[model samples]
Target: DRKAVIKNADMSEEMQQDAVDCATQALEKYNIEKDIAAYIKKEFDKKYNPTWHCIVGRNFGSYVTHETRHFIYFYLGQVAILLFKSG
Candidate 1:
């Protein structure tokens, strides 16, 4: 599988979901197992969620927000959405 990157905050919600859905579908299409996906999720969680903090809500919610508002997905496939708002 090749790496895909999504960037910018003005992207459409549909497009972001397309990327995620595409990734999920591609994983299944390629017969990639849960263990592999778990590993990948684990690595991502380590950075975004971290072991010290509970990140389930944050992680999933962030994605939802990004898909809704449009956010940048970094080169590493990490969505670079802003968690803070400007005053």
Candidate 2:
């Protein structure tokens, strides 16, 4: 999964692993359950393409416009509740 995210980037193997490690650490730091964390990481990799990350450096706000930012948060909130309920 992490491979796919950094596959097209002009990054070394170590850099790719570093990026993946940072993302995994974020998931753990947030206390996201393993089941939901995997899905969230997958979505993160999908949503932020290689070039996008190159330009923005993993900052979601760099790509999200003001008009859509609220919607993103709202959707994530809903997803959190759904995952919590399911668990």
Candidate 3:
């Protein structure tokens, strides 16, 4: 339905909500995909610990190394949002 939909996640359920929240917020706030990613990335870093990363786009495959229970992949409308933290 073009809403925030979880594609895959290893994160806690509550934490996943935060990812979705930030994704939608950033999506609404920014037209440029890079800006959307940065907003979500920085917001996560502010909320949790250091060094969060986010990638938002229409088409891509992802292979990432992230901290356990700190990875979330979701779609907001048509765009993909990939978010995670590193140790």
Candidate 4:
């Protein structure tokens, strides 16, 4: 499975789960197939930067984190690329 990518990331367990949940939600919301979703997850894993960890987490100051927001935007951008390719 593509779990290794998230598991290997230098992030907290909660944040890792957040990334998984975000990926799952994007797949479901966009009706993306498992294979495509897994590829996206792999790409995300490859591109993930430790510095961006600060932008994620269960909390930051007074604001509660919604990690899926980032993934959703990323997914939408990918969708646009796919649409453009197919059009």
Candidate 5:
């Protein structure tokens, strides 16, 4: 989610719109339920606090990068996964 946010931070208006359009179409194509989507969106936004974005970016790249680093250091126990996971 933060990856999607940070990755789109510098996107052009057109590209951003395209992403939105595609995402919307994909959801519709799959006939995805709104309740699950809403829950996931809420959880994603909760994970990415905009207030912490600048701090995260300045100190740890972006929130996405920070999250990835955290997962690498604390979550993934396998050396191979840890080593390959780092950007």
Candidate 6:
């Protein structure tokens, strides 16, 4: 019953899906919030190169200076996923 629902995104559909899929997989495979964030961040760094960031938690908010076309915010179940890039 955990499906990603986009709340805000400054990212393309393809990349947003990538973030969502990665976030979903992390959630399904892990339990800790910080660990999930690390998994998503590491995956992006490998796939899209360096300088990626991820935050996973419930009802959390962040103000990030992010790279263009490389930011996303979504929710899966009650947990929120925030992924962004900065150089």
- Full ranking by TM-score: 6, 3, 4, 2, 5, 1
Per-residue CA lDDT of candidate 5, range 1-87, in tens?
Answer: 112232323434553443344334434343334432343333334443321121111122223443332221111111011101122
Candidate 6 colliding pairs:
none
What TM-score, over all chains together, does every model reach?
A: 0.27, 0.30, 0.94, 0.31, 0.29, 0.94
Q: Give the winner by lDDT.
A: 6
Please give the CA lDDT of all the candidate structures. 0.36, 0.32, 0.89, 0.36, 0.28, 0.90
Better candidate by TM-score, 2 or 5: 2
Candidate 1 CA-lDDT value: 0.36
> Model 4, residue 46: displacement in angstroms?
21
| Per-residue lDDT of candidate 4, residues 1-87 (tens digit) | 223233123345554555555554555554545444454454455555321221222222322233432322222222321100000
The reply for model 3, stretches above 4 Å from the true place, is: none
lDDT of 3: 0.89
Q: List, residue by residue over 3-39, the lDDT tens digit for candidate 6.
A: 7799989998998889988988998899999999999
What TM-score does structure 6 among the candidates reach? 0.94
Model 5: which residue pairs collide?
none
For candidate 6, give the lDDT of residue 86: 95
- 17-85 in candidate 1: lDDT tens per residue? 544554444344434334334443444344334321111111444432332342334222342222211
For candidate 3, report its TM-score: 0.94
